[PDB]
Amino acid sequence: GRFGKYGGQYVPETLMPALEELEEAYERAKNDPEFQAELEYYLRDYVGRPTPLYFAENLTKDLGGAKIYLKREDLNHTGAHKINNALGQALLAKRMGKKRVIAETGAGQHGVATATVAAMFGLECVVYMGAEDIERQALNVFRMKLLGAKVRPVTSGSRTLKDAINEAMRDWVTNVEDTFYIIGSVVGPHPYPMMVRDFQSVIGEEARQQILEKEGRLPDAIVACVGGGSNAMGIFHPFIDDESVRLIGVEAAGKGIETGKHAATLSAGRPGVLHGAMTYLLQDEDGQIIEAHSISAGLDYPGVGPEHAYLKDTGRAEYVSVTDDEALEAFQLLSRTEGIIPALESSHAVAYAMKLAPELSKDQIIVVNLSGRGDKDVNTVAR
């Protein structure tokens, strides 16, 4: 459960038996063809995969360099990649006889994804959400309730995403007999980094086949925004062995790294243990966890997947950051040049691809992971 020195299972002993049961369960499901065939059925008919790989021709011409392809995860049911993972984990919960699934959510996208698959599967669903995030995501809170989930506000600690994950863990350890904890990113104790990355590898597996068919070469670079890291790992993993393919994760610099108000865990954090994983963390000099800051709430996890920690240290992937202002300009440019309104999270990736495309030749190819649609962010951008 280790990615180099990173990862692990840093959880209380009260939770170790639950993790053993989960890793053994996942191991069986992974290699069971009925499980994989049932998951593929729902990915196709319910989620709507495969998502297309779209040649952004106006953008390509505007920037004057590399070809820009957008992996259209904005077309999934619910509008983001998150549902790929919620779906796989909920199917495993049913296979383990769990009547109840819980989830954390920050901006509400994972909470919506989890409530969505829970409704379809008939599972009881409870979503933990910090009260500061509730206060800012009234619409996503109302979606979760429409979908039949209970929203439990977390008023403890800093009242945001990290505190919601703590409470969900507490719920899980207490109710493990009947409850499955659907984690929202490639974070937490083994086997969750591995398992979430596997359920999201469908993104890169499609993307790899689609680019070969469309262009007959592999990308020169793949650009994906990185909060907890799950959409990035999903498109990165199937290209890990393609040594010529650059893997570029884009974090939120907020107002600027130098201001301290950012969410750039990989570029400015330092190693530590959070939520069961050894990884990079935004933390203070006493090892206390710090809040991350971004114009997009979805990039607000102060940690990052331990597998990105490993890819950064080995140099297989390169991690950069773009400011709120740059994300905003990409949000606007992509809308008016391709008619795609991207999530402000994914706008960070679009923004770095705009910096890189002009510096490549016209024969080269950038794939941008369009991790979600930005209808949810239209109010924010107007403000």
């Binding site: 009260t14 170790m16 403890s156 600690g157 505190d163 507490r170 207490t174 330092r270 939520h275 966890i289």
Partner: protein, 261 residues
């Protein structure tokens, strides 16, 4: 020999049971913690657990969550609890002190640097709630190097295999978690963890003298935290926090003992 071992050996020779209070260090502030430690000793506590406040205490119920948030807003740091322990040691070299801390403050501080400061300040043992044996190799070797005990938790759902493995790395005592869950005063309730000869203490949920007495009949020691932290929180607020804690812990002390016939 470690103060923890000396304490348990002395109780064994007296036919007595260890009462082990837990308080959060720096709640409501470190001067009050000091006063509380001194009160706890005078009230008969045999070992004192000091919680090092963490911003994301995965293993704590709401009571101790709130104490940690209060302790952190009052500026509590590792270095400050160390200085308080050194002020303690100026006048009390006897009482065993255990730091209960999540791992990331220890990491970050520097593992060997942290155990070294433990030994120099006078901290006898460590409880690290999110650190299983499989991840504790580094801390365990530094602890062994400096004579600091590493107390591991055993939960009701831990398998005989996991117990063997836990007790193989444990020192000081084994912490038996009474409930599969989080800290917090509960109302209810074997192990019987003898693949080891270490003393066994039971914690989580023990909130009343009657419950403490029930626990004292089966284990070498009784750990009480949330119930004591409640009395700190609920005063609310004159430093008369001390009298309520002292009064409660004196009830616990009369209760933690082998029952009479």
């Amino acid at each position: 020999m470690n103060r923890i071992a000396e304490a348990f050996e002395e109780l064994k020779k007296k036919g007595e049971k260890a009462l082990i209070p837990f308080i959060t260090a720096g709640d409501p502030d470190l001067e009050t913690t000091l006063e509380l430690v001194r009160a706890l000793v005078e009230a008969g506590a045999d070992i004192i657990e000091l919680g090092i406040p963490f911003s994301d205490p995965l293993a704590d119920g709401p009571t101790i969550q709130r104490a940690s948030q209060r302790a952190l807003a009052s500026g509590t740091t590792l270095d400050k609890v160390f200085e308080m322990v050194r002020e303690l040691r100026e006048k009390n070299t006897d009482v065993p002190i255990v730091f209960l801390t999540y791992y990331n403050p220890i990491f970050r501080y520097g593992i060997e640097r942290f155990v070294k400061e433990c030994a120099e300040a006078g901290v006898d043992g460590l409880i690290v709630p999110d650190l299983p044996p499989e991840e504790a190799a580094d801390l365990a070797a530094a602890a062994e190097k400096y004579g600091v005990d590493l107390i591991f938790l055993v939960a009701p759902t831990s398998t005989d295999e996991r117990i063997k493995m836990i007790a193989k790395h444990a020192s000081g005592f084994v912490y038996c978690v009474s409930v599969t869950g989080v800290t917090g005063a509960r109302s209810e309730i074997s192990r019987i963890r003898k693949h080891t000869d270490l003393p066994i203490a039971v914690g989580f949920g023990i909130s009343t003298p009657e419950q403490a007495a029930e626990v004292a009949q089966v284990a070498d020691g009784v750990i009480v935290g949330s119930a004591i932290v409640k009395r700190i929180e609920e005063n609310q607020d004159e430093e008369d926090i001390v009298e309520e804690v002292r009064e409660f812990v004196r009830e616990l002390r009369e209760a933690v003992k082998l029952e009479h016939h």
